[PDB]
């Protein structure tokens, strides 16, 4: 399809038709974005060079704009010499505008040709030309070619020095020539020369714009060359303490902010003390605000740990200031000092912390302005950090939040509810204590609300579900009453049900899904809601289990499995090629298989009493048997259960690496499920069977204070209980499983206590990344295999492009693509499989690291079979830490 577009663009560019030519040129970037293939990009860039060589001086500007726009698609050009020659063939003209456009184009290409001496000579010659636009274009190209190309930097530094110090150029030309010195970080001598030049320029050209631009260049050089950053900080502090202008002070403040953002470890105690002394002597508010912002940025890193008493006094003084931003920065500094540092007297500061938070709550409660909401969010995330890094003051902040919830005109209560939900994820006693007040607010909030009643109700329901644990009391009926006669917004109640299913409340989820099943404006969403309702019903019926019960447990398991089958059927009935549901189907199917394995296990444990000893005793005496102790027919069932659990754990590990887009919570939930499955497998392998097989004691710590959810803590406690009950009964009784089946069934029931936790990735699937993997084999439009001599060779020439529908750097980053290739026989040779060896020796596991969004490897294979074969390839993207991340593109070609 791209060939037709290239052909039509060529036909449009053939005739003159200046309008049509400009149209084609400005449409070329869309063709680049649609097809990132290297051959098409190379051909299009060659055609652009052709139309740039001869033109009416206006197509050249459009081609320059296209080149400046499509910069990432520039390194994937095969023919570079001819392109550069066609671009440079127009710089010898006498037209200054044409030469300026050519210089700007060359500067835009400074990432693919950093060693072409002709371009360096042209920039050197046209830098001191008698013009106005050509000089600016030469300056731009010189900056671009001085970014890279250390040789060009050492060749242009002296010329820039003379052109700046020649006192024969206007102030604007010097202001434009100064930022060229930023790219002098190639050698120590270059850095020293640029530093001396900038010092001389500051001491000899005292002016607002001049000093501003020179200091910006100097700090960019110091930040790109981390050799003299303390001297930079000292100079900035000296200019903050001495220079009386206001613009230079704000420039130095933003400079220190950038330095703390990028390189915070180079700071010392003297620099912080000097900055605090300068902030204490500032009579203005914006300057003190910027200095405190720099201090807050610094205190969030190891600088606050290396500093450890002026910063503490400054933070205590600016915590109760009149303005809100300064107080927010002060309380942020105080919270960071409390969390990071662990001094003795600083404990008292904790008081000054919590009450200080109140100073940020009574001023941004009913203000309704972004300037107040920013400080409110700052204080709220600071309180979250203080509560998650120090549980000693977890109640002293939640009580203030509860008391302040009554002092908002339905504007800040959403943020307070978000803060409460984020804090309650660690300790459930806060939710146990504040559930009553949350229900009181939910009851008194249903009076009247129009502006943002939807989000407010959603946040209230979310924090209530987080605080609650059962949601089976009158509170559920009260929430239903408050949501029924009020506005029946489908999205609000849908989000409420989603949060209820996420937190584990399944009764409210089932009620809301039943209420939403009757109002669906389509068919796919109807099946989705029906599947959610069936899953919630099966979850609720799963909780209907009693401790030490085995009669009704089988009926509950059977009805839950029936509801799960109905739900997965209604869900796969909604699976469409457009936006397919792959994670949900697999997750539900694996949950169903796990529960079926548990049902088989409990059925075998119950049938163990159905005359199992005398069953296999007719062929061999099972009593006192050294070969197979207590040999019975139950051994086959135990082995089947063990292999089923092993396959389930393998499928869990596969599903973990098959998503690549799940959040931390969903990955942790999958890991916990696989851990429970492996624990049940270890219990059925080491306890029910012979204990002399492994006999490995779990003498190690577990369940550290790092779980960010109550479900994870409950799962870890159940794991610890199972381990402590299995480590003691290992060598107690005979392996006929007299008391081992009892504790096994108790562990099975304990694992079924927590119903489930549908994590965030189950809905709103974001970060949709995909590798195209469009190889370039011989032309094969039909399904007929490529005619090969079967003896010479067979090439692949595989190449793939990554495509991210959402923000790439959100959760994980693509670093390596472990391309794999295999071959097998299609036709049956002797058996149902390919052959005795299937010709799967040719693997060639290659590990390519694509620097840009493109990669290309070379694959081969040698086969001497006159039949038809099958060639398949896999992406297997690798992240930064390093995980297989088995993707499922499944690109299969016959020959």
């Amino acid at each position: 399809d791209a060939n037709s577009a290239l052909m039509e663009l060529d036909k449009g560019l053939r005739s003159g038709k200046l309008g049509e030519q400009c149209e084609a040129v400005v449409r070329f970037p869309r063709l680049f974005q649609k097809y990132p293939f290297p051959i098409l990009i190379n051909s299009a860039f060659l055609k652009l060079a052709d139309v740039f060589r001869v033109g009416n001086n206006f197509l050249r500007l459009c081609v320059l704009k296209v080149t400046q726009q499509s910069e990432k698609h520039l390194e994937k050009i095969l023919n570079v010499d001819e392109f550069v020659k066609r671009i440079f063939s127009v710089i010898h003209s006498n037209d200054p505008v044409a030469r300026a456009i050519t210089l700007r184009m060359l500067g835009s290409l400074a990432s693919i040709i950093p060693e072409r001496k002709n371009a360096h000579h042209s920039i050197r010659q046209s830098l001191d030309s008698h013009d106005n636009v050509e000089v600016e274009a030469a300056v731009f190209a010189a900056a671009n070619f001085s970014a890279q190309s250390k040789d060009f930097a050492v060749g242009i530094c002296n010329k820039i020095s003379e052109m700046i110090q020649g006192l024969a150029t206007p102030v604007d030309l010097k202001l434009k020539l100064i930022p060229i010195l930023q790219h002098m970080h190639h050698d120590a001598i270059l850095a020293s020369s640029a530093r001396q030049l900038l010092q001389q320029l500051v001491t000899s050209y005292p002016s607002t714009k001049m000093v501003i631009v020179s200091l910006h260049t100097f700090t960019l050089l110091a930040a790109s060359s981390l050799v003299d950053t303390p001297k930079q900080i000292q100079l900035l502090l000296q200019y903050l303490k001495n220079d009386p202008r206001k613009a230079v002070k704000r420039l130095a403040i933003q400079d220190l902010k950038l330095l703390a953002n990028k390189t915070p470890h180079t700071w010392s105690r003297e620099n912080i003390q000097a900055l605090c002394e300068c902030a204490l002597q500032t009579p203005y508010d914006s300057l003190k605000l910027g200095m405190l912002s720099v201090l807050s940025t610094l205190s969030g890193t190891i600088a606050i740990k290396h500093y450890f008493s002026d910063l503490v006094k400054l933070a205590q003084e600016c915590c109760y200031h009149n303005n809100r931003g300064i107080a927010a920065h002060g309380v942020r500094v105080l919270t960071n000092i409390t969390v990071s540092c662990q001094e003795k007297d600083l404990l008292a500061l904790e008081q000054d912390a919590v009450f200080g938070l109140e100073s940020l709550l009574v001023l941004c409660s009913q203000d309704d302005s972004p300037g107040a909401q920013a400080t409110l969010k700052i204080a709220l995330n600071c309180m979250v950090k203080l509560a998650k890094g120090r549980p000693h003051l977890s109640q002293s902040v939640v009580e203030t939040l509860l008391t302040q919830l009554h002092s908002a005109q339905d504007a800040a209560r959403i943020l307070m509810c978000h803060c409460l939900a984020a804090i309650a994820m660690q300790l459930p006693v806060l939710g146990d204590g504040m559930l009553g007040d949350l229900m009181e607010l939910y009851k008194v909030i249903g009076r009247s609300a129009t502006d943002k009643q939807q989000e407010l109700l959603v946040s209230l329901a979310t924090v209530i579900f987080v605080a609650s644990q059962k949601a089976l009391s009158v509170e559920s009926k009260a929430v239903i009453k408050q949501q029924l006669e009020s506005v029946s917004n489908g999205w609000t109640v849908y989000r409420i049900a989603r949060q209820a299913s996420r937190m584990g409340n399944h009764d409210m989820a089932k009620e809301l899904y039943q209420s939403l099943l009757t109002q669906v404006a389509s068919e796919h969403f109807y099946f989705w809601l029906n599947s959610l309702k069936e899953f919630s019903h099966a979850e609720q019926c799963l909780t209907g289990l009693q401790e030490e019960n085995y009669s009704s447990a089988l009926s509950c398991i059977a009805e839950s499995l029936k509801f799960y089958h109905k739900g997965i059927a209604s869900l796969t009935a909604a699976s469409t090629p457009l936006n397919p549901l792959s994670f949900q189907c697999e997750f539900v199917k694996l949950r169903i298989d796990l529960l079926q394995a548990f049902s088989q296990l409990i059925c075998t444990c119950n049938s163990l009493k159905t005359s199992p000893p005398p069953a296999i005793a007719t062929t061999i005496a099972m009593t006192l048997g050294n070969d197979l102790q207590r040999c019975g027919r139950i051994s086959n069932q135990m082995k089947q259960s063990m292999e089923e659990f092993r396959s389930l754990a393998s499928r869990y590990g596969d599903l973990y690496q098959a998503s690549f887009d799940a959040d931390s919570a969903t990955l942790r939930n999958v890991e916990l499920q696989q851990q429970s499955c492996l624990l049940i497998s270890h219990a059925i392998e080491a306890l029910i069977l012979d204990p002399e097989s492994a006999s490995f004691q779990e003498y190690g710590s577990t369940g550290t204070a790092h779980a960010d959810s109550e479900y994870e803590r409950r799962m870890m406690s159940v794991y610890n209980h199972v381990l402590e009950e299995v480590e003691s009964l290992n060598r107690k009784y005979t392996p006929v499983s007299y008391m081992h089946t009892a504790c096994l069934c108790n562990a099975i029931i304990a694992l079924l206590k927590v119903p489930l936790s549908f994590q965030r990735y189950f809905f709103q699937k974001l970060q949709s990344t995909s590798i195209k993997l469009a190889l370039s084999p011989s032309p094969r439009n039909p399904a007929e295999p490529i005619a090969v001599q079967n003896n010479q060779q067979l090439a692949l020439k595989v190449e793939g492009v990554v495509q991210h529908g959402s923000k790439p750097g959100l959760f994980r980053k693509i670093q390596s693509v472990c391309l794999n290739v295999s071959s097998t026989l299609q036709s049956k040779s002797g058996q149902d499989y390919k052959i005795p060896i299937d010709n799967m020796t040719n693997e060639m596991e290659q590990r390519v690291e694509p620097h840009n969004d493109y990669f290309s490897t070379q694959f081969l294979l040698n086969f001497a079979i006159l039949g038809t074969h099958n060639i398949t390839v896999e992406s297997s993207v690798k992240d930064a830490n390093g995980i297989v991340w088995k993707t499922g593109p499944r690109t299969t070609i016959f020959v």
Binding site: Q514, L517, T518, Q519, V520, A521, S522, E523, Y526, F527, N530, Y550, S551, A553, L554, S555, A558, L561, K562, H565, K566, I568, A569, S570, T572, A573, A574, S575, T576, P577, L578, P580, I592, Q596, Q600, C603, T604, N606, S607, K609, T610, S611, P613, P614, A615, I616, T618, T619, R633, Q637, Q640, V736, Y738
Partner: protein, 616 residues
């Protein structure tokens, strides 16, 4: 087949008090109870008490026969094993009569005869499972099937054997006793079901010997009532989807659950949407069974879905139309019917087509779900014209089409949907007017995810003859001009906006001479959306520019009042850019042709350089 489903489900969990609830049902599975009460290990106190209670409750009239069978099985622990080993060795070496000498009286008197009969049966089963396709030699123990099944259960509980081989032998010999095997161990039900499901091919269970295996699996699922859905899922995922459909129909007819949505449709929905393997499997299955009429599961499924469909017919009979609570289920059933009859579909009948036409012509409550249902019914009646054979059906369908054309304005005003059914109606009307049928195919395959074909420009052609009857250019153009403009477009909602039919009308012809100057609608459409750039806006502007220098189809030149009231300073960026593009295209067209036949087409009404100097 009377396999004591409740008693088996009770004994699977625990046999504590259920022994007294079954008096005559404790006759087939009595061997397992006798073996558990006689050879008990007495591990725990509760287990010993349960065994004692079971032995006390097993004091029936047949207790003597059970004790004799237990004694015979205990005495045949070493001798019968050696005899079976010798028989297997002889069979392996060889491979490389007065009711069979009173076989009924010998197996019930001496344990050696029963052991020899069991060994011969196992050898025959192994020979039939190695390489053979037959189900004969079953009338040997027809008169003594109870004693034979009891002896087989005793041999399976006393001697080591394979459960899958025994299940296959039972399914190949007599399924009536196969379920009895499930009463022997009551622990390998899932394994036996998986083995029976994996012991069949894809194109079977219709007119082959697999019907007996399917009936045995259905009987086992009915006697279990717990793993029926699991067995149906395993069948639908591996092979023999007919057994899964039969099990689903049986579960839907036995249990009264799934009231909001029929489980039959819930299971049949995933056949022409995804999972191409099972998709083509069900496709070839229904293709092979379509010609065959003597098959029970598919006709029972058609009957149950037909009655579930007609349960909603009295509603639209006594009332105006459907209700809000039954407007989504009807649309789902209609989409399922469409997916079933998409490609290589089955042949319908009149007794179902009548109700189909009656439900597809109902009155929705003016809900977006009802609009989607009306659109789906319209595409269904347009893709299949198997209703013209009778006069009453065609007259009612054209009356309902006229009613829809009349009430499209109400349905679009009350229901805030982007693309209603009236837009599609006007689009297909313009397509029929423009004398082409591929656009109708693109429309019916673009409204829903089914890339199917109906007929190479021969099925919908009949509708063309109806198009020239009443729905002529006098009403379709009026309905296409009187549509409300779309506000705040998104270029992402599925459907055909009025832009498409307006573009088609401006492209085909505008020779009405009484319905020109649609510039008001164009301005009201391009007033303020600003979110998308619809791919049809530029062709619409192009064909509107071309609709000015055309003979006798004179429209207004969009006088400068709208430009001077728009570009004065919600008239967003996109609206201003579109107006500027329109002005530039008009200025370009004023210089392109310059010849308008020199017949009363001498009023271009160009700008006098007083507006171009104002617009930046």
């Amino acid at each position: 087949v009377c396999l004591a489903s409740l008693s088996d489900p009770e004994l699977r969990l625990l046999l504590p008090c259920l022994v007294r609830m079954a008096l005559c049902a404790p006759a087939d599975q009595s061997q397992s109870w006798a073996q558990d009460k006689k050879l008990i290990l007495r591990l725990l106190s509760g287990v010993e008490a349960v065994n004692s209670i079971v032995a006390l409750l097993s004091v029936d009239f047949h207790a003597l026969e059970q004790d004799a069978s237990k004694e015979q099985q205990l005495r045949h622990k070493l001798g019968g094993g050696s005899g079976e080993s010798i028989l297997v060795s002889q069979l392996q070496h060889g491979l490389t009569k007065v009711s069979e000498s009173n076989g009924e009286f010998f197996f019930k008197s001496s344990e050696l005869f029963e052991s020899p009969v069991y060994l011969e049966e196992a050898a025959d089963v192994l020979c039939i499972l190695q390489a053979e396709l037959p189900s004969l030699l079953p009338i040997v123990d027809v008169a003594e099937a109870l004693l034979h099944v009891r002896n087989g259960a005793w041999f399976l509980c006393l001697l080591v054997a394979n459960v899958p081989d025994s299940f296959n032998e039972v399914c190949r010999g007599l399924i009536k006793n196969g379920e009895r095997q499930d009463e022997e161990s009551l622990g390998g039900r899932r394994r036996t079901d998986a083995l029976r499901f994996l012991c069949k091919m894809n194109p079977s269970q219709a007119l082959k010997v697999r019907g007996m295996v399917v009936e045995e699996c259905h009987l086992p699922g009915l006697g279990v009532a717990l793993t029926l859905d699991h067995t149906k899922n395993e069948a639908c995922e591996d092979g023999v989807s007919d057994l899964v459909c039969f099990v689903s129909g049986l579960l839907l007819g036995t249990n009264a659950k799934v009231r909001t949505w029929f489980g039959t449709f819930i299971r049949n929905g995933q056949q022409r949407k995804r999972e191409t393997s099972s998709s083509v499997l069900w496709q070839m299955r229904r293709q092979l069974l379509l010609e065959l009429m003597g098959i029970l599961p598919t006709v029972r499924s058609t009957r149950i879905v037909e009655e579930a469909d007609v349960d909603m017919e009295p509603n639209v009979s006594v009332y105006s139309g459907l209700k809000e609570e039954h407007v989504v289920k009807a649309s789902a059933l209609l989409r399922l019917y469409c997916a079933l009859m998409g490609i290589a579909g089955l042949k319908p009948t009149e007794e179902e087509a009548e109700q189909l036409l009656q439900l597809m012509t109902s009155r929705p409550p003016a809900t977006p779900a009802g609009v989607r249902f009306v659109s789906l019914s319209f595409c269904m009646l347009l893709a299949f014209s198997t209703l013209v054979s009778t006069p009453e059906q065609e007259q009612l369908m054209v009356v309902w089409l006229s009613w829809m054309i009349k009430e499209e304005a109400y349905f679009e005003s009350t229901s805030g949907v982007s693309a209603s059914f009236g837009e599609m109606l006007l689009l297909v009307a313009m397509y029929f007017h423009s004398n082409q049928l591929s656009a109708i195919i693109d429309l019916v395959c673009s409204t829903l995810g089914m890339k199917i074909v109906i007929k190479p420009s021969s099925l919908s052609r009949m509708k063309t003859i109806f198009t020239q009857e009443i729905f002529t250019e006098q009403v379709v153009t009026a309905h296409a001009v009187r549509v409300p403009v779309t506000s705040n477009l998104s270029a992402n909602i599925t459907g055909f906006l009025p832009i498409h039919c307006i573009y088609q009308l401006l492209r085909s012809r505008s020779f009405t001479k009484h319905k020109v100057s649609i510039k008001d609608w164009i301005y009201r459409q391009l007033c303020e959306t600003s979110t998308p750039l619809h791919p049809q806006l530029l062709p619409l502007i192009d064909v509107y520019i071309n609709s000015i220098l055309t003979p006798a189809s004179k429209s207004n030149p969009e006088a400068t009042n709208q430009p001077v009231t728009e570009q004065e300073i919600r008239f967003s960026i996109t609206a201003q850019l579109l107006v500027l593009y329109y002005i530039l295209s008009y200025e370009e067209a004023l210089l392109a042709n310059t010849k308008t036949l020199a017949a009363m087409q001498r009023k271009p009404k160009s700008y006098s350089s007083s507006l171009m100097d104002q617009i930046p």
